[PDB]
Design a protein around this ligand. Structure first.
Ligand SMILES: O=c1ccn([C@@H]2O[C@H](COP(=O)(O)OP(=O)(O)O)[C@@H](O)[C@H]2O)c(=O)[nH]1
Ligand SMILES: CC(=O)N[C@@H]1[C@@H](O)[C@H](O)[C@@H](CO)O[C@H]1O
Ligand SMILES: [Mg+2]
Ligand SMILES: [Mg+2]
Lengths: 446, 503, 503, 445
């Protein structure tokens, strides 16, 4: 009875939640070295360090300890430290939406090459150092106690691990997987059934546990192209193995899956989705939004004169280019600038419509925050990532005729109109009711 | 002892940060405390000195970083046109001129001189360039003698600066620097060598031989911030914050996003012995923000960055219904909207003037505005000139600036008594206007949407011109000008100095 | 106030620099002068302590550079194998003993421990080798707690050392370093980062907090001397000089060549307070050379290497007509020529037995020639014994020295009173012998001319034995040994202590 | 009559040496910038600076002005400067008898890139700094005063030479050539016949002055291969040019050069050698001398066994390596450790034979002084330049005819048998009596 997740990304968390609403609360294990973990879940690296639980206080880019008088810089994309103006440290910001929160800090040699990497948690002090050899090759990663007494030392080359716990004999493992099994035997978890999202080590622990009592399920997510991986068809031509069933939430994959290897495998290909948590309803206001890291936004000059009924809110906390300020002379359009990390969501509160015509990088995972807030997503072939949550019917041509997107969006002036138009976009990402999870996952221990 | 003041650079048109030093200089001249104003930037386009004297400085008060190493000390350019052409072999016949430029010709071997005059009608020469065969091989800069020389060479059919050099009065080599693509690299002194301009300032401060009670004052961090701190802890150090000091927008109660100009000092504040701002309003905000966030309690004073020698009365007839504005003339000042408020005020009250004094960004797209808009000769874009009595000759003042730490242009306006119209924001706007008397403050939605702000602007403009308040709120501006006056400005300083020398 | 001493490294087999420095401690102990001796080179293969003990050092006069940041104190190895097996998980099967090499096996998994013993009989372990799958991974060093570790990794299937970590008394990390190409490229504290081991020493010197009441002494410039001088000018600095400071055959009246180990100090000597030489003749010849080539005049003091508690007075039989000497039988000793000094002299001088006390290689060139020559039984051949006593039971000490800047073979040879014979050469052979009193000097043609002095050695010996000055000058040998007693050395070492700290 | 040589050479120095012996005393100018020129000469770059003529006190390696505490490192063939051991500056040495004298001193950056070079004269002024750009290319050269002022700036791209002298107006020269033509006129130097060693700038000065009266002479010390330099073809056809006649010394290089020329072409050359005066005659000793830096010598032992009769003198200024000490077991092997200039010219006089088998590179031009004292200069292949003085009769390879190397010398027993092997080498260096120079140029006064 375990959630085993190899890496953390938002594409994982959507599994944690869908099972949570479907009523599976079982212990959760993460292979990755992440320190920002939402406290519902633990990792074999972070358990034995000894920091506290329920404390979210990262370090601010200016706080990272540095030698006397040495000068810190940060731009809200990255941060840097310079002895006499010369680059020494790189600081990378957390995956977190909040700007200027410290995840990893890399130091460079006198020649600019990478040497040391000191990772940071969500609790605000350095919990691991990573070392590099020569050509920027990974060497080892040291893990520290709270006091800094050595606890975990992993040698990336061989794969061996050193465990010196507090006032504890020294064990030396061999492979990453052997350590994982030691972490499920140290906590005495219910191993009745195990859930995992990848063909990586998380999958491998299922292969190491092959004899043990239980059956296991793989939720496969990552996209497929022309052939199934060899570690995948391994469950299809073998029987005994702990994992007996493959669940694919995205249908575009579930359709291509049964489309390769013939005969029986279509039994152990099931189909599900992710029951989300929507944060609010639509309300059908006339107010819209586009988020832009890069001026400009194609097709734009057309659509403003096209529907004077409505208002365009487009912004960057970056400095605005003077070419987009010329559009302001059309007074249906307001421009926001240099937005508070609570004032970005001011637009996501008062906008019901988001349009990916942006040409540059999605900022702050813009498409996704619109989806959770139900903002109807409409765009072109020049849309952004992730294009996961957008229905094909709402996708349109790249700079080519843009007013089909108008009179089709204009068609949502009624409540029944928006509701029916959302559900297409709703089930693009395979939103399902919590009922479907009860049925499909009732077949195993409940 | 002495008081050293660190500022990067200066132009003719230089910012109010730079003017603050100038005002601050004449202050110290009357407290019997000597000082020096250091300048790190590369100053070539004109002579360093004409910029110094221009803003009110005295020549012997300025230490130019690239100067002080030599014996030649700062001074106006005394070199005649005839003095240079006497330094050349042969003689010319054909001679051109345009603007500040003179070009002599000796084209038996293909060579000539492009000369640069300090100003047109005079014969004094700032720059002298030499071009043989059509390539530039040397360029000499002047004050009373040759105080530096640049050498060049072609690359991809372009003039390319490779090495510079500096000289003494005897024409001896102090140091020459090498140039790789617009950035200095190495400095050859006979006794030393250096690979970074940061570590050159380290040598400059080091040779200044600071004593226990000496004072180093930081204005601009950029690029020198680190090298200032390390080598100043011998003496007492201080940093004065001229602009707004953080971003309230991206700040939670947990996190405070500072301003890059001052960040390195706030993080490391402990090493600094004192801090300075101008409005005590700013003090209590920051100093409270200071302890709630990083829990550091440095000594912070309150001093105005420009004063009144005396408050001015404009004897000559009070010019009717006049407006005036001045600033860096940039995006931040939002001069655009002032141009929008007047042509419609040109309606109910014609003839009323407005004058724009400044040199900077987008002066052009302003001049592109009035030609087409409804002011033919209704507005004056006059550049940047001396306003010493000029404010006094105009009826009202306008600032559309969104934030100002002091905003001296209206500090010099309340010495003319003039009424004021602007936004209600920290700091200088929430200092120099109490809406009941003198001027008017406008609350502002946090947004820029044209229709809202410009229309409310003249709402309180015409309640003045017509009528009854333009006479007596000119005196209240005077009675609040009494608050910041040199007698008080000189006062806070003199004590604060030995307040640090206490220990 | 303290006195700090600096040297590169140390080991079981040591050189004259360390024992001179080792003795230098014992004197400074009776001075009530607190002394610390700083060692630099990386010392692992044996513990740092065990090599301080056997040269005699006191553990609390020992500041090891790479130890200084760890709150561990310099300690001998108290750690057993049983203490080790308590930190390891599992139980061993095979236990092999090859020597100090003790290899435990855990073939249950693929891990095994090779363990290193201080002495094959003892329970004492210095360092441990943990290995998985035949691939060495971690290595660990012990004094009273693990104070250091190394981390390896295969390269071309050869275990290659990469990073090395120093711990605290509680097991927490003090700092770590990166090794590329057997070189130390980066050091990381929690509060610091270091790219140059050269610049690392600078951190050490600012952590020691040297006041002006302190004193610094440098032995080898190699690896340090630049930064040492720079960080030492707060306190008082001095450079000791052992062996020869120059090469005369390479130097003319116009220019002077120093030794590669002494060249930096001498050239920059004006920063160093004082210099220390072995002899007085070295103090004079150097002092003569200094003020000529470059006009700079540092102060020089004379101090010996070793010393003498008591002049060693015989009542034993004083065996007339005998010889004695002590060296290692090295080709530099040029003692193959001293063999004909015995065999040609014997025809005139009956019954003279010289004694051989030394051990080196190419020694069998010495045992091979003595026998084929006419007299093979005249002279004994022996490796070593405790020398300090025997001397008085022989007559004259014989020295083939090319040059020796100092020696205590002759310092203890004037302890028992023996007359000596050596060439006139710098220095010790020249400062213990005046050609008129107590011995004879043999100026050498600039060459090795074998038979030239082959008799000239034999010549002077018979002047001692025939006769009458045989003991007359040997009693004068106590008058020269008098000045070098361990009592007067203690006088110059404290008088020098005020010859520095006074001004 | 003047001498104009581009660059000072062991080539040129023995050329100006031999001319004095014929009575032709003409002044000497060098287009090169060197400061170690002996007292006879001058260069346009060195003359106006004011460096006192005749003085010798070159800077010792450890006197080069360095920052505080910056460490100056040791000397064999090079010296180096470092800040915390990080490599900063190289001191390139001079070429002279006493070592470790400063010729060039270069600096660097933290990346090891080239940047500055500050040259020194035999006095040791910092008289020329030199700057270099991105690709480690050149830039310009400032020839300084002794007071620190500017005199000459040669801008190495355009070539334009800025000359600002003391108290005088500023001039600008289009190239290095016009600078030469300028420097001559002020010194008032008679041009009626002129001698130069380089096809380079030395040559271009003539083609400018073709109108002025007289005739000129060009000398070829540089080897040829297959075809002539393009400027050499111009000398053949053109006549009105001041230069009508070319000169080559070498018995080999003369005819292989005239091989490429028609019947018309050849009559404009004359062939002739140099005059080396030797400090003493031969006198057929049995002794031999070798000068190395470190170990070791190829077939050193196999020769020791192939001759008993004479001594092998090997020497070093560095404390010798044990491989060399081991050979001392045998009576004919004698070393010299850390040997002295006093011990040096003694060993050159005690020996009649030099052997260049020493690995590494030459010792203070030991080869040249082997030829000057009329020893027998010889060796294998993989020798030490200069090969300028050795013949083919006396040379071998890889210690293979190490046995007949012996017999070649053993073939010299008869008092004049050596002299037959001697003047085989004596014509390879093209030694010829000054009676020859006089007969050739009596037409050319
Ligand atoms: O025409 C002008 C405009 C500007 N100023 C000076 O420039 C300063 C502008 O300062 P302000 O604070 O208003 O602008 P900022 O500091 O933001 O650049 C004022 O103090 C004036 O003394 C001036 O002398 N003449
Ligand atoms: C926009 C702004 O903040 N301008 C301020 C100005 O108000 C103040 O008078 C001056 C001197 O401190 O510094 C500038 O930065
Ligand atoms: Mg530093
Ligand atoms: Mg330094």
């Amino acid at each position: 009875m375990i959630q085993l997740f190899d890496y953390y990304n938002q594409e994982t968390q959507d599994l944690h939640d869908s099972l949570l609403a479907a009523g599976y609360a079982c212990p959760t294990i993460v292979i990755e070295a992440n320190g920002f973990l939402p406290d519902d879940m633990i990792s074999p690296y972070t358990y034995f360090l000894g920091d506290e639980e329920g404390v979210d206080h990262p370090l601010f880019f200016n706080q990272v300890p540095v030698p006397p008088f040495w000068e810190i810089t940060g731009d809200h994309q990255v941060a840097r430290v310079s002895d006499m103006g010369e680059e020494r440290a790189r600081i990378h910001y957390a995956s977190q939406a909040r700007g200027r929160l410290v995840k990893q800090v890399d130091w460079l040699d006198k020649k600019g090459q990478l040497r040391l990497s000191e990772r940071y948690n969500k609790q605000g002090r350095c919990f691991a150092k990573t070392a590099y050899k020569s050509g920027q090759e990974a060497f080892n990663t040291t893990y520290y106690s709270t006091d800094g007494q050595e606890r975990i030392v992993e040698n990336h080359v061989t794969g061996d691990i050193i465990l010196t716990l507090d006032q504890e004999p020294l064990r030396i493992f061999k492979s990453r997987v052997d350590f994982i099994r030691f972490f499920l035997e140290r906590l005495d978890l219910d191993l009745d059934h195990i859930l995992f999202n990848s063909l990586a080590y998380s999958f491998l622990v299922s292969h190491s546990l092959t004899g043990r009592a239980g059956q296991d399920i793989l939720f496969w997510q990552e996209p497929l192209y022309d052939e199934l991986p060899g570690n995948m068809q391994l469950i299809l031509d073998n029987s005994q193995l702990r994992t007996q069933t493959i669940v694919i939430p995205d249908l575009a994959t579930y359709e291509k899956a049964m489309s390769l290897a013939a005969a029986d495998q279509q039994q152990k290909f099931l189909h599900l989705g992710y029951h989300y948590d929507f944060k609010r309803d639509n309300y059908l206001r006339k107010d819209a939004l586009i988020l832009t890291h890069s001026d400009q936004i194609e097709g734009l000059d057309t659509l403003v004169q096209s529907l004077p009924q409505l208002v365009f809110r487009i912004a960057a906390l970056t400095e605005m280019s003077p070419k987009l300020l010329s559009m302001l002379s059309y007074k249906n359009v307001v421009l926001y600038q240099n937005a508070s990390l609570k004032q970005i969501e001011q637009l996501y509160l008062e906008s019901d419509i988001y349009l990916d015509i942006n040409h540059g990088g999605q900022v702050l995972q813009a498409v996704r925050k619109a989806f959770e807030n139900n903002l109807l997503i409409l765009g072109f072939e020049q849309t952004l990532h992730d294009r996961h949550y957008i229905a094909q019917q709402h996708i349109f041509d790249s700079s080519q005729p843009a007013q089909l997107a108008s009179i089709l969006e204009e068609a949502l002036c009624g409540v029944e109109q928006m509701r029916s138009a959302l559900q297409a976009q709703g089930r693009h990402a395979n939103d399902v009711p919590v009922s479907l999870y009860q049925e499909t996952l009732q077949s195993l221990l409940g | 002892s002495t008081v050293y003041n660190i500022n990067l650079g200066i132009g003719w048109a230089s910012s109010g940060v730079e003017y603050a030093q100038a005002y601050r200089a004449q202050i110290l001249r009357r407290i019997q405390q000597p000082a020096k104003f250091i300048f790190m930037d590369m100053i070539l386009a004109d002579n360093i000195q004409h910029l110094t004297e221009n803003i009110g400085f005295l020549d012997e008060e300025i230490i130019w970083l690239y100067n002080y190493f030599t014996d030649i000390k700062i001074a106006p350019t005394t070199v005649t046109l005839d003095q240079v052409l006497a330094q050349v072999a042969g003689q010319p016949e054909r001679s051109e001129k345009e603007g500040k430029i003179v070009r002599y010709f000796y084209p038996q071997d293909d060579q000539f001189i492009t000369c640069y005059l300090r100003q047109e009608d005079q014969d004094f020469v700032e720059h002298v360039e030499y071009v043989s065969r059509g390539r530039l091989i040397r360029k000499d800069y002047f004050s009373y003698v040759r105080y530096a020389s640049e050498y060049f060479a072609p690359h991809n059919d372009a003039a390319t600066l490779y090495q510079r050099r500096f000289y003494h009065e005897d024409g001896s080599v102090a140091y020459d620097m090498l140039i790789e693509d617009g950035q200095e690299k190495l400095y050859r002194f006979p006794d030393r060598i250096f690979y970074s301009k940061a570590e050159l300032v380290r040598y400059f401060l080091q040779c200044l031989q600071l004593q226990a009670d000496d004072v180093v004052i930081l204005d601009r961090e950029t690029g020198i911030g680190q090298v200032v701190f390390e080598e100043s802890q011998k003496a007492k150090l201080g940093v004065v914050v001229h602009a707004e000091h953080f971003s309230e927008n991206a700040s939670s109660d947990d996190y405070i996003l500072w301003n890059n100009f001052y960040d390195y000092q706030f993080t490391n504040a402990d090493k600094v012995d004192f801090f300075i701002v101008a409005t005590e309003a700013q003090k209590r905000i920051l100093e409270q923000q200071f302890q709630h966030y990083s829990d550091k309690q440095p000594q912070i004073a309150t001093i105005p960055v420009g004063s009144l020698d005396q408050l001015t009365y404009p004897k000559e007839p009070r010019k009717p219904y006049s407006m005036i504005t001045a600033s860096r003339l940039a995006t931040e000042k939002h001069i655009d909207w002032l141009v929008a408020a007047t042509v419609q005020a040109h309606a109910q009250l014609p003839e009323l003037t407005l004058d724009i004094y400044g040199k900077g960004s987008e002066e052009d797209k302003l001049r592109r505005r009035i030609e087409e808009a409804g002011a033919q000769d209704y507005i004056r874009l006059k550049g940047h000139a001396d306003l010493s009595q000029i404010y006094a000759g105009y009826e009202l003042y306008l600032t559309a600036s969104t934030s100002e730490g002091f905003g001296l242009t209206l500090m010099e306006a309340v010495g003319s008594g003039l009424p004021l119209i602007g936004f209600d924001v920290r700091y200088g706007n929430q200092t120099f206007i109490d809406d009941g008397k003198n001027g008017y403050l406008l609350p502002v939605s946090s947004n820029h949407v044209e229709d809202q702000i410009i229309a409310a602007f003249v709402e309180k403009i015409i309640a003045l011109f017509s009528q009854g308040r333009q006479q007596e709120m000119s005196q209240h501006s005077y009675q609040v000008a009494e608050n910041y006056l040199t007698s008080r400005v000189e006062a806070a300083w003199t004590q604060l100095l030995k307040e640090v020398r206490d220990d």
